[PDB]
Task: inverse folding
């Protein structure tokens, strides 16, 4: 059959934490807010 | 609180928002980071019915590099965190049989090609897959985030569970293959952190993912400029000149490039010989030694007598034997170098030299050794004093400057160039690499023009590919001294084998001997970093 | 299997915009109205 | 009333307060002058 761009069966595996919680700890330390930060400052 | 600078009002104003709308309507813009809405080619895997249980067909660690877009963007940042989905699309025949096991190896653990790895939680997909399998690699870490230099992350491994099998296949020694394409898509929780000041370095060091060119067509040697044509597995590899390590250090006297050798000779009255001394040189790395001065020396001792090429009939193409005694050539193990010489006519006193100055230029034969006016002794420890040139040089007190460019080599025997410690020139020490645990070191081979023979050529060893020497020289790379920068080489056939680069700069292979039948139009791809203690992978017949 | 004259599964492509938008832009600049325009005017 | 100097906006911002929280959670910070909560030789 036909397979699109994100198509595909996703399998789950034993060693596997909480993606979200980890993400938060990162942005917490990082300070991430906007995805394209180079749009918020002037570059030489 | 306050932004530096004052906003002024310009007349031509961007005021319209509709313009944007129009743009959007005709382009169909939705999301801002499109690479997150689709899988993109990463690598391909050819699963063969010869590859047995336990073999690893794929092993990558979570890193921006496993994705085209992710990677190109990472160059802008200094921090990343999050996982990435890896989608495998197996495409074989519905009549085949076989399973493939997937497993996630936590950070701090190096996987090995053993079924032991399966005494750990693992899922498996079959050879006759219908819909793609997506494995999402979690980002297990003990730090709020990752530093662009970090490599020790979760590793995805694909091992052969049950050997692929084809019924319709003949019983005769043959083999069928089942192709599998690997793509990636950054998971939702994936993100780049702080921007990195363009031009800045990575304190701990950039990952060595570009030390070997993608096409073997751009593989020049760090010893001879000719492009690589083969490899040679040796229980010990060594070299010093133009060989750089990950610290960017070099025990040599030349840069990672090939440039003309500006030299300065001096002749003296009454000299029945033709060997000369080098008194000075312009462009030079190590003070006194000319940048690019050949790395090989003469074989044995011999009287400094004028002579020409001369090889017995033991060198006539057709004889599988060569007696090194027939070779009467005195300037053996010498590097042929085209030249453009000039003479410094002394002040107005006696222009008896203006005669030797107007003479046409000769091609000098360079080498490195000790020069006792009567006999030339082979010296493998270079110094501004052991620089020796040989040709039809003037027999009158003089000072001549020349600019030469190595083009060939005075053949000595069947053995390849620089395949022996003793004949390898060095200054302080001589870098080396020995076989370590199933991983043998290699020499990159390329052809070099020879002596008086026809358009013939002999083999020349090289410790690094010119580029590795360049990158490693001008770059800020890094990797644990107990690891290897692994790359996978694929020939223009179904053959391939991994190459690991040592911190010292030498390359290894997981075989005790590489094939000859290698269809040379080659292609290399970075695999990642592995403990040296693990046997480099390969699939060769 | 028998395939008719218009038979076929339509698959949607990732990089594709909304037709209706561009569509009208055309109709608007072009003034398109009927189809066999030659039905609406006498020709020499 | 006025503080000498002008505050400008830098990009890498300290904005996160959670960082502090994490610090605090793993160190167990309570009081600011710890030497006041115990006798010392």
Result:
């Amino acid at each position: 059959e036909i397979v699109t761009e994100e198509q595909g069966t996703v399998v789950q595996q034993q060693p596997a934490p909480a993606p979200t919680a980890l993400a938060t700890l990162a942005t917490a330390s990082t300070g991430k807010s906007v995805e394209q930060e180079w749009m918020t400052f002037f570059s030489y | 609180t306050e932004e530096q600078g004052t906003v002024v009002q310009q007349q031509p104003a961007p005021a319209p928002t509709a313009l944007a709308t129009l743009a959007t309507a005709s382009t169909g813009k939705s999301v801002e980071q499109e690479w997150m809405t689709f899988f993109s080619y990463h690598t391909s895997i050819n699963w063969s019915t010869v590859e047995s249980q336990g073999k690893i067909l794929y092993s990558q660690a979570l890193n921006p590099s496993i994705n085209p877009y992710l990677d190109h963007i990472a160059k802008l940042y200094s921090t990343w965190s999050g996982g990435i989905d890896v989608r495998f699309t197996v495409s074989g025949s519905g009549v085949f049989g076989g399973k493939l096991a997937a497993l996630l190896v936590p950070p701090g653990v190096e996987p090995i090609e053993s079924v032991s790895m399966l005494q750990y939680p693992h899922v498996l997909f079959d050879a006759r897959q219908t819909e793609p399998v997506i494995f999402t690699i979690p980002d297990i870490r003990k730090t709020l985030f990752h530093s662009m230099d970090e490599t020790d992350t979760t590793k995805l491994v694909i091992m052969v569970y049950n050997e692929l099998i084809n019924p319709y296949e003949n019983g005769v020694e043959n083999k069928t293959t089942c192709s599998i394409t690997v793509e990636t898509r950054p998971s939702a929780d994936f993100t780049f952190a702080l921007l990195k000041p363009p031009g800045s370095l990575i304190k701990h060091g950039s990952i060595p993912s570009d030390l070997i060119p993608r096409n073997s067509a751009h593989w020049m040697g760090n010893r001879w400029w000719s492009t690589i044509s083969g490899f040679s597995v040796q229980p010990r590899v060594f070299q010093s000149n133009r060989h750089f390590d990950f610290d960017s250090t070099t025990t040599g006297w030349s840069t990672p490039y090939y440039v003309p050798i500006e030299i300065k000779i001096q002749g003296k009255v009454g000299s029945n010989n033709k060997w000369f001394h080098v008194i000075d040189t312009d462009k030079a790395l190590v003070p006194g030694i000319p940048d690019g001065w050949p790395d090989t020396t003469i074989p044995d001792e011999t009287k400094a007598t004028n002579g020409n090429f001369s090889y017995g009939e033991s060198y006539r193409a057709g004889s599988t034997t060569i007696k090194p005694n027939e070779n009467s050539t005195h300037f053996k193990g010498t590097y042929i170098c085209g030249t453009l010489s000039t003479v410094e006519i002394p002040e107005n006193d006696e222009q008896q030299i203006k005669t030797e100055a107007e003479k046409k230029s000769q091609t000098m034969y360079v080498v490195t050794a000790d020069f006792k006016d009567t006999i030339v002794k082979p010296q493998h420890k270079i110094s501004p004093q052991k620089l020796v040139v040989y040709f039809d040089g003037p027999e009158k007190d003089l000072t001549m400057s020349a600019t030469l460019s190595p083009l060939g080599y005075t053949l000595v025997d069947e053995q390849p160039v620089g395949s022996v410690s003793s004949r390898v020139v060095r200054i302080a020490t001589l870098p080396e690499a020995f076989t370590q645990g199933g991983n043998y070191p290699i020499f990159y081979v390329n052809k070099i023009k020879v002596g008086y023979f026809d358009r013939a050529t002999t083999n020349c060893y090289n410790s690094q590919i010119l580029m590795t020497s360049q990158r490693l020289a001008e770059g800020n790379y890094n990797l644990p001294p107990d690891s290897l920068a692994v790359y996978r080489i694929t020939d223009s056939s179904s053959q391939w084998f991994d190459i690991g680069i040592n911190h010292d700069g030498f390359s290894y292979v997981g075989l005790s001997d590489l094939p000859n039948d290698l269809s040379f139009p080659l292609t290399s791809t970075f695999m990642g970093v592995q403990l040296a203690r693990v046997k480099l992978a390969s699939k060769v017949k």
Summary: Chain D is about 25% helix and 0% strand.
